[PDB]
Design an enzyme around this catalytic site. Structure first.
Site, PDB file in Angstrom:
ATOM      1  CG  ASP A  20      -8.296 -68.380 -55.140  1.00  0.00           C
ATOM      2  OD1 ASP A  20      -7.484 -69.319 -55.232  1.00  0.00           O
ATOM      3  OD2 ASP A  20      -7.952 -67.198 -55.015  1.00  0.00           O
ATOM      4  CG  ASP A  70      -3.535 -70.417 -56.499  1.00  0.00           C
ATOM      5  OD1 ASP A  70      -4.733 -70.150 -56.238  1.00  0.00           O
ATOM      6  OD2 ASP A  70      -2.739 -69.578 -56.956  1.00  0.00           O
TER       7      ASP A  70
END
Ligand SMILES: NC1=N[C@@]2(c3ccc(F)cc3F)COCC[C@H]2CS1
Length: 394
Positions: free
Chosen positions: A224, A34
């Site tokens: 992201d 992440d």
């Protein structure tokens, strides 16, 4: 870096994970990669969506930090106990790091049923770490404790009873040339908190959206890997859907499709990709007044979903959604490209991925330079709250 190729797996829309080991002896866990958070956090207590979890008691190398951590986010929450342990990435660099670990004791809408991951590897900066910026993120520990160069790169490759399996590569400490073709173009990291960038122009099938460029970065634009969709600010999302609707007008889909709450289907192998436009995001270049574009295909923003009922049809979900927290260049965007998180030079590199999904007529592209005379600042300045202002940094 061959040892690192194909070190990522997952299910479509459920995130890409890397296998990691924590503790002595090593406990193996699948960890979500992440780039939109900064904590290394692992399931450490039973939960109905976890096959396994980190057991602190079994580790001779575990050191309790005697501090809790509480992490609410938009769609949910996670919380746990802070500590440190030995951490390694079996299909990563041949090193072992003592890193901070948040042992997740309770969570709300965090773990995904069937995702096959038990934790998260927050790769963004200390500024957005919880409880605060003194909790050193995993990457910072890895660079500080080993000779691993301060850069990592991601090649995310996109795909009845189960979701489709996805694969990819996380190259720690380098750039693998067999994962991309053509040139690598760099956009500056605006600020080291999220991997924040600046979009200077948006085109849909070569047609400029003609908005003030600050709208594209309102209130920020980030890269992201932890978000599936391309997420756009309200006004940008509306203009985009209006333009995508116009170019695909020949077919009229239900309102639920554009909201990403309904699939649209076509007879197997008959999807009319050509009616769907390409989306071009122009990113600020390393040179003032320059930009380069990243071009995404409908194959990236129309996510395939296999219908159990109509298995004789190819069904898709619209993977562009509305945001109130700025632009999110999620996996939909990243899937077209090999993305270089060059922390050492405070820049993000994009090149055409050796694995992206495409047709005989169009390809995902990375092209430049594009020049603009007397370019306005496209970056947005977040209103300063008394809370953020009060904070002391020593
Ligand atoms: N990039 C993101 N990372 C988080 C996240 C990703 C995937 C997931 F499945 C659960 C999650 F909680 C973890 O850090 C806090 C914000 C949220 C939402 S967006």
């Amino acid at each position: 870096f061959v040892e690192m190729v194909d070190n990522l797996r997952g299910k479509s829309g459920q995130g890409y994970y890397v296998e990691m080991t924590v503790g002595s002896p090593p406990q193996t866990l699948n960890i979500l990669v992440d780039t939109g958070s900064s904590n290394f956090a692992v399931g450490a207590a039973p939960h109905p969506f976890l096959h396994r979890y980190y057991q602190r008691q079994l580790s001779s190398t575990y050191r309790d930090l005697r501090k809790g951590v509480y992490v609410p986010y938009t769609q949910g929450k996670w919380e746990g106990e802070l500590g440190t342990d030995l951490v390694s990435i079996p299909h990563g660099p041949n090193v072992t790091v003592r890193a901070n670990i948040a042992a997740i004791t309770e969570s709300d809408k965090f773990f995904i049923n069937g995702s096959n991951w038990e934790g998260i590897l927050g790769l963004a900066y200390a500024e957005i770490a919880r409880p605060d910026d003194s909790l050193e993120p995993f990457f910072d520990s890895l660079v500080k404790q080993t000779h691993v160069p301060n850069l990592f790169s991601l090649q995310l490759c996109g795909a009845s009873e189960v979701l489709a399996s996805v694969g990819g590569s996380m190259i720690i400490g380098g750039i693998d040339h067999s994962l991309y073709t053509g040139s690598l173009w760099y956009t500056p990291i605006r600020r080291e908190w999220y991997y924040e960038v600046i979009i200077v122009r948006v085109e849909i099938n070569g047609q400029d959206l003609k908005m003030d460029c600050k709208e594209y970065n309102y209130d920020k634009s980030i890269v992201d890997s932890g978000t599936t969709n391309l997420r756009l600010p309200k006004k940008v999302f509306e203009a985009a859907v209006k333009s995508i609707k116009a170019a695909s007008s020949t077919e009229k889909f239900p309102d639920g499709f554009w909201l990403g709450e309904q699939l649209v289907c076509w007879q197997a192998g008959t999807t009319p990709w050509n009616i769907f436009p390409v989306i071009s995001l122009y990113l600020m270049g390393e040179v003032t007044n320059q930009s380069f574009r990243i071009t995404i295909l409908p194959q990236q923003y129309l996510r395939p979903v296999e219908d159990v009922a109509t298995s004789q049809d190819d069904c898709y979900k619209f993977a562009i959604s509305q945001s109130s927290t700025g632009t999110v260049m999620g996996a939909v965007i990243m899937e077209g490209f090999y993305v270089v998180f060059d922390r050492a030079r405070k820049r993000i590199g994009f090149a055409v991925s050796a694995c992206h999904v495409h047709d005989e007529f169009r390809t995902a592209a990375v092209e430049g330079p594009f020049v603009t005379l007397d370019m306005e600042d496209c970056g947005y300045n977040i209103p300063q709250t008394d809370e953020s202002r009060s904070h002391h940094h020593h």
